[PDB]
Structures are given as structure tokens and as C-alpha cells.
From TrEMBL, chains A, B:
It comes from Pseudomonas aeruginosa. PROSITE patterns: KS3_1 (PS00606), KS3_2 (PS52004). The gene is fabF. SMART domains: PKS_KS (SM00825). The keyword Lipid metabolism applies. This is 3-oxoacyl-[acyl-carrier-protein] synthase 2. Involved in the type II fatty acid elongation cycle. Catalyzes the elongation of a wide range of acyl-ACP by the addition of two carbons from malonyl-ACP to an acyl acceptor. Can efficiently catalyze the conversion of palmitoleoyl-ACP (cis-hexadec-9-enoyl-ACP) to cis-vaccenoyl-ACP (cis-octadec-11-enoyl-ACP), an essential step in the thermal regulation of fatty acid composition. CDD domains: KAS_I_II. Keywords: Acyltransferase, Fatty acid biosynthesis, Fatty acid metabolism, Lipid biosynthesis, Lipid metabolism, Transferase. InterPro entries: 3-oxoacyl-ACP_synth-2, Beta-ketoacyl_synthase, Ketoacyl_synth_AS, Ketoacyl_synth_C, Ketoacyl_synth_N, PKS_Beta-ketoAc_synthase_dom, Thiolase-like. The active site is at Q163. Belongs to the thiolase-like superfamily. Beta-ketoacyl-ACP synthases family. One of its GO terms (cellular component) is cytosol. Pathway: Lipid metabolism; fatty acid biosynthesis. One of its GO terms (biological process) is fatty acid biosynthetic process.
Length: 412, 412
């Protein structure tokens, strides 16, 4: 019968910092992690900025020997995973290694490595492709390498649900624990899509902000002058743990994971429906799963990508689900500061939702100078808002019409 | 408690055929689908052959214009999915569409599209990258496009666990039904990795057979002259359905899905342990999940990839799990005929396991001319073996040490 799931450890790389506390400091200060990209020449591209991880030192985590085999998205996912395991205080033993698994996902995986190898193939032939090309680029190798390095023998898998990946990974990993398939899961996502193919591909779709001359102002969820999402890199990982398992070892518990929803829009390959119908179905599934009155929701970490259609769909969904209570809750987009970490967005936003519960503060939506038509909720414009938060919801929506919602609440 | 899950529809593209019955006729005749790869200059490559899908006509499923947006692996996954839904006779309505979801996966997704868009980017710059590059290449777009086309609003996700994908996809979809999160799921996997990048990438790891002179003899699981796997393309999809839901509409039930195991080896990025400890844990987990004694197993569809270490690991795991019963079951590798469909392997092999139950016949391991040291089980060498089969297992092992086992039983 269904067990309770709590969060005992968190880990992160983001455009705002190389761990959770540094990133969260940035979030509560309204700081932008968006800047012109330095790691390649984008003069031919329509978008030349994004949210890069700054000063990542893989030698805090991995031998130079292992690191050279791995795409940046795998390095970032292992960094966040290792942080989360250390933060949890969990000791892996022969007694518990079969009950600890991992589900770290990605939207696009090792696109930098794949591009570099494609260049080698075309210019120099197949004998110049790296022997590590497949295992060093494939999405499941965060799960795989973490399992090998820590000796985790529980369920081992990876999701890829585009911009919903991190939210789905955490929710499904919680179900594994709830249903008795594991006692502990490391779950989240990682992404590093800032190669020519990534910036070029989203650029070809005209999906990205082109505010090159003012990158920190580009991500402006619900602002009338928004012109698309900002591409960002990084990782989030949580240690999810069965409640009695955590209590038995005297774990520090950040919060309880009480609800998870999924739904499909069944609408369009890339566009969310204007009325947010699929997002509303997803949130209602999540709130029913948590056994909650919708009026218990205090804070929503929105998907809030800074696209014209997505941002207004989310207002329409939140009004549909919460009715008059839509005017009492606080909803913000931390993507205003971090940009869109794609498959890692739901993982870092789950962590920000847990810290909102820990610190009783709604992070701001920076850049919200002129809320658009109908964007008249408490969107925490400009500055962090201390407030009572017992229940926090984190939403994600992705290509293929795929929706996820996590519901967290305070634990005492 | 848990609801029962049955298989009511199946769909496939394989190197043996453009549907399930043609593919299965090839399997029971011991036919090879392996041949030199056409319309591609593989002179510079150490492997020049594989399992291609022959004569696929996407316009039976999609308009030319919608097909142009999608990588071949997505086309293949949608073909199998549409076949499976047609075969099930399910009618989607407003009363059930929130209870019908999708989990179609892939191991390495849209290599062909990545190759072609790299070519554009390198020769012409980023403004010639297709607008459809991202949504037409990402792994979750089989689930996405299928849900849009059929109006499915249930759980919508995608796994990517390398060579384990199709097995994990089916098993997790069965959990969604068992635990009441859906009444129907379409689940399975698809793969098209015969580009330069797939053959080049696996070739750089020296993982592939190089038997260019006799491609039909290349895939020879447990044979002493095996020299690595054969890369193949295609897709498998099953309609999974709650038992009372299937009985109520008079569905034709192929078999029951009674068990699912996962485990991580935590051993090595690409190599399984010689003793098959991880595969043994996974099979024991799946039999425990089914409430079955090892003695009740009649037929195993091995992973049986034709690699030196993988094939012998599986013999060790089967001896370990089954003890005095290990010689009484039959175990075969249909990869001897189909080659290795990577993330689609577990999907087509689940279908072959279900048909072994329907037809009371173990498919052959072709090319097993000289069994290797210790390969002394009943590996169904050369020719199909009619026999009693009440319980059939299908095993998958992949990069990262990820394992999956499905347990099927006859239904009456
Ligand atoms: O949790 C870990 C960790 C686990 C295994 C190896 O490192 N760390 C150390 C590395 N960190 C930093 O460098 C902080 C940014 C300053 C973050 C905390
Ligand atoms: O989803 C994507 C993608 C990148 C750009 C557009 O879509 N990728 C591709 C490459 N993949 C792989 O597994 C690597 C090849 C080995 C799967 C994930």
C-alpha cells in the first residue's frame, strides 16, 4: 500500500550558481544568470546569449580520465546527483544498495558531443569518431554512471519528455518509492543544448528571444514585450526517500512530495492550447493525488517560459483550476532569472519550490514591467515576497503536449 | 492491491517484415533480415551491413508533408503504434480519452535528422537548419504525435534506457495501468541508427560484428565465432489494457503481463558482469513481481546480442536463477535473425514472447553452429521448437548496466 515520500537531499548547477545555496541566493536577490555566450562564436545566429553554467569545475566531482569521456550534460547531471547524495547524508551499503535507484533525464542529451563527432565524420571519416561517442552522449548515462560510481542497484532509468523531463523524472521516481519498488531514488534532469545545433535549431523555429542587446531583460514571463524563451544549461537532482526510511536514519527532511499529475494536451507538436486545458487537467490530477482542497495551494512555480502562447495558457489554466483562489496564491517564473533549462527546468524548479517552503518566500518574476492582457494574478513582479507557504506546486509543459505537476508541502 | 494487465494489440516494423505476422513468419522460418546497407557509401567503415526496414511506406500512416517533419525513428514508432491500436479494436471517446496514454521510447533517437541538419549547419550556417529539427527529432515525439493524432489525454512520456528502452517502456506502462493511473497504454520503442553516426559510433567502440562477407551469419548468439552485435532498425508497439476493461468490450486478449523487473548492474558503462549478477537480480525481481517460482518459466527470449561478454553473462544469470530447471526451459535470441534494434529490441522481443505463447513454439537461435564453452542450455539452435509454453520471459540489458525483464503468461 502507498508509502509517503520526502526530500532529504538536493543538488544543482544553474546559471546563478554551482550549487543549491548560491543559486537560491541569486533567485531571492532577483539576479539574472543570462549573458552573451562565450564558449562559441554565434555571430551568424539570431540569438547569441543564454544561461551558461559559469566556472564549472568537473575536477570537484570526476577524474579528468572519466570526465573527458562525457558530454557536459552528463557532467552537470553527475555534479547535481553527487551534491544531492552528499546533502542527504545517505550511506550506501550492501544492506540497502538494491533499494536505491536513479532517474536522471534530459530533453536533448549530448548534442555538443554529437555535433563535434558529426564534424569529425564529415571532414575526416568514421575512424575519427570517439570510441566514447555513444556512452558519452546517450541520455541514460547520468543514471548509468551515477549507479556505477555509488553502487546503486535499484531501478535505473531515464525519461526524455522535452521541457517536462525533470518534473516527470521526480514524479515517477516518487511513484517507484510510493509503490515499494525502491526506498530511495536520485531523480531530476540535466541539459547542455548550447551548441550550434541547439541555438540554431530553436532559432530556426523562431522560439527564442532575440533580445541580444539586453540579455538580462530577455526572459520576461507574462510581460507584454516577451519574444520567446532563453536557452539555459544546468542540472537539478533530489534524493527522494520513503518517510519511515528517512525517520529511521534521522534524516533531515526538507519537505514532503504529496502529489504528481501528468496529462497530454493532444493539441499540437509544439504549441500549448490558448485555454491551458491540458495544464489544468494535469494540475487537477496532481491536487487529487495529494488529497488537497485547491485553496490549500499557496505558491506555484510556473513553467513561465516567456513565450507569447505558453505564458497566457498558464494564467488560463490556473484561473480554471483555482477559481477565486487564483487571486490569493502567489505564482512566479524563476525562468525570469535562470532562463529555460529544458529537461533540467523541472528539476531546478522543484528544488526552488522546496526552498520556497523552507524559507516561506515566493521568488520573484523579474522583468515583469507591463503585465500582458489577462495576466492579473499575483505574479510576484520584480521582488521576492515573504508569505505563508504550506503547499507549493511546480508545473512543466513540453513539446508533444506533455504536462507534469508536482505538489510539495511542509513536513513536521 | 493491483489490477491485471493484458495485451490486446501489437504492431511492428522489423528487418523481417512491415507488420507483426510477416515478421513472425520470418522468425519461425529462421530467416535473416541482415544485409549490406543500401543508398549509403560505407567504404570507409569497418561494418557495411545491418537490419534495415525494407519497403516502408510512411504515406500509409501520414501525409507526405507531416512525414517530412519527422525523423525515420518517429515514423517507425508511429507505424507500429497505429498498427497496435488498429489491432486492439479500441474505440477512443470523450468518456475514455483521459484514461489512454502513450510511452514509446528510443535509445539514440533522431541520428539521421542530426546528420542532415549538421550537414546544413557546417556547409551553409544555422539559418538552413530545419524549423522542425527539434520537435521532429526528440524522442518523446512518437508519444506526442500519437496522442495528438488519436486524441489521447492519459499519461504521455518516453523512456530512453539504451538497449533496455522497449522493455522498460512496456513494464512502466503496465505499472501505470496496474496502479490505476490509466486503463490503456500504447508502449514500446523505435530506432533508426543506420546513419554514418550509428555505424561509425558503435564501430569506434569495436562493438559491431565486421563479418561483411556473410552478413546473414554475422549475428550468432552463444556461437564461439561471434564478434559483436548487428545494428538494426524498426519498432514495436503493444496495446496494454486493464483486464476488466478488455473483457467488457470483448477485446481479443493475446496474453497477460504478470511481472516486470528492473535492476542496475552498477558494474560498467558498456560491459555486463561475466557472472550476470544484474540480469539474475532483475529476473528474480520480475518473477517475485509475478508471484511465480523459477520452475514455472518455459521460454526466455534472451537479450542475446552476439557480443562475447553479454551472451556468456546471460547463460550464467539463467543457471543462477533457475538452478535444476535451467535446462528444461528453452531460451533463444531472435537477434540471430533481426539483429539488435537497440531501444526497439525489447518491444519487438516482447511481441515475439507473446506470439511464442499464442503459437506454443520457441523461435530459433539461428547461426548457433558451435556453442561456446558453458553454452550448454537449450538455446533452440537452428530451427523453431514447438513446445509447451505457459510462462515466457523477455530480458534486456543495456549501457549503464540497466536491466529489464518482462514476464508474460497464457490467458484463458
Ligand atoms: O556536494 C558536493 C560534492 C559531492 C561530491 C563532490 O562534491 N560539493 C562540493 C563541490 N561544491 C562546490 O564547489 C560549491 C560551489 C562551491 C558543492 C558541494
Ligand atoms: O533528442 C535529441 C536531439 C538533439 C537535437 C534534437 O533532438 N537527442 C539526440 C541524440 N540522442 C542520443 O542518444 C545520442 C545519439 C547518441 C538522443 C537525444
Amino acid at each position: 500500500s502507498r508509502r509517503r515520500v520526502v526530500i532529504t537531499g538536493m543538488g544543482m548547477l544553474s546559471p546563478l550558481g554551482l550549487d543549491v545555496p548560491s543559486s537560491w541566493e541569486g533567485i531571492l536577490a532577483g539576479r539574472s544568470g543570462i549573458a552573451p555566450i562565450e564558449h562559441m562564436d554565434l555571430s551568424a545566429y539570431s540569438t547569441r546569449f543564454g544561461g551558461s553554467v559559469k566556472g564549472f569545475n568537473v575536477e570537484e566531482y570526476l577524474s579528468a580520465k572519466e570526465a573527458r569521456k562525457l558530454d557536459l550534460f552528463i557532467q552537470y547531471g553527475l555534479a547535481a546527483s553527487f551534491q544531492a547524495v552528499r546533502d542527504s547524508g545517505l550511506e550506501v551499503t550492501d544492506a540497502n544498495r538494491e533499494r536505491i535507484g536513479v532517474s536522471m533525464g534530459s530533453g536533448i542529451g549530448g548534442l555538443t558531443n554529437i555535433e563535434n563527432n558529426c564534424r569529425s565524420l564529415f571532414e575526416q571519416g568514421p575512424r575519427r569518431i570517439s570510441p566514447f561517442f555513444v556512452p558519452g552522449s546517450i541520455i541514460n548515462m547520468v543514471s548509468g554512471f551515477l549507479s556505477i560510481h555509488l553502487g546503486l542497484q535499484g531501478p535505473n532509468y531515464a525519461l526524455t519528455t522535452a521541457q517536462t523531463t525533470g518534473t516527470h523524472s521526480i514524479g515517477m521516481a516518487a511513484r517507484n518509492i510510493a509503490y515499494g519498488e525502491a526506498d530511495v531514488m536520485v531523480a531530476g534532469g540535466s541539459e547542455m543544448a548550447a551548441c550550434g545545433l541547439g541555438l540554431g535549431g530553436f532559432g530556426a523555429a523562431r522560439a527564442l528571444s532575440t533580445r541580444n542587446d539586453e540579455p538580462t531583460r530577455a526572459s520576461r514571463p507574462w510581460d507584454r514585450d516577451r519574444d520567446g524563451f532563453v536557452l539555459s544549461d544546468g542540472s537539478g537532482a533530489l534524493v527522494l526517500e520513503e518517510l519511515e526510511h528517512a525517520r529511521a536514519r534521522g534524516a533531515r527532511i526538507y519537505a514532503e512530495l504529496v502529489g504528481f499529475g501528468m496529462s497530454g494536451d493532444a493539441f499540437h507538436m509544439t504549441a500549448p492550447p490558448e485555454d491551458g486545458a491540458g495544464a489544468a487537467r494535469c494540475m487537477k490530477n496532481a491536487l487529487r493525488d495529494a488529497g488537497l482542497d485547491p485553496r490549500q495551494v499557496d505558491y506555484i512555480n510556473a513553467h513561465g517560459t516567456s513565450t507569447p502562447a505558453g505564458d497566457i495558457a498558464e494564467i488560463a489554466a490556473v484561473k480554471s483550476v483555482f477559481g477565486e483562489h487564483a487571486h490569493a496564491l502567489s505564482m512566479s517564473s524563476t525562468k525570469s532569472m535562470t532562463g529555460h533549462l529544458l529537461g533540467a527546468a523541472g528539476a531546478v524548479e522543484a528544488i526552488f519550490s522546496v526552498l520556497a517552503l523552507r524559507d516561506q518566500v515566493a521568488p520573484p518574476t523579474i522583468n515583469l514591467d507591463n503585465p500582458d492582457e489577462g495576466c492579473d494574478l499575483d505574479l510576484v513582479a520584480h521582488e521576492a515576497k515573504p508569505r505563508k507557504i504550506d503547499v507549493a506546486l511546480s508545473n512543466s509543459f513540453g513539446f508533444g503536449g506533455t504536462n507534469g505537476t508536482l505538489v510539495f508541502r511542509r513536513f513536521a
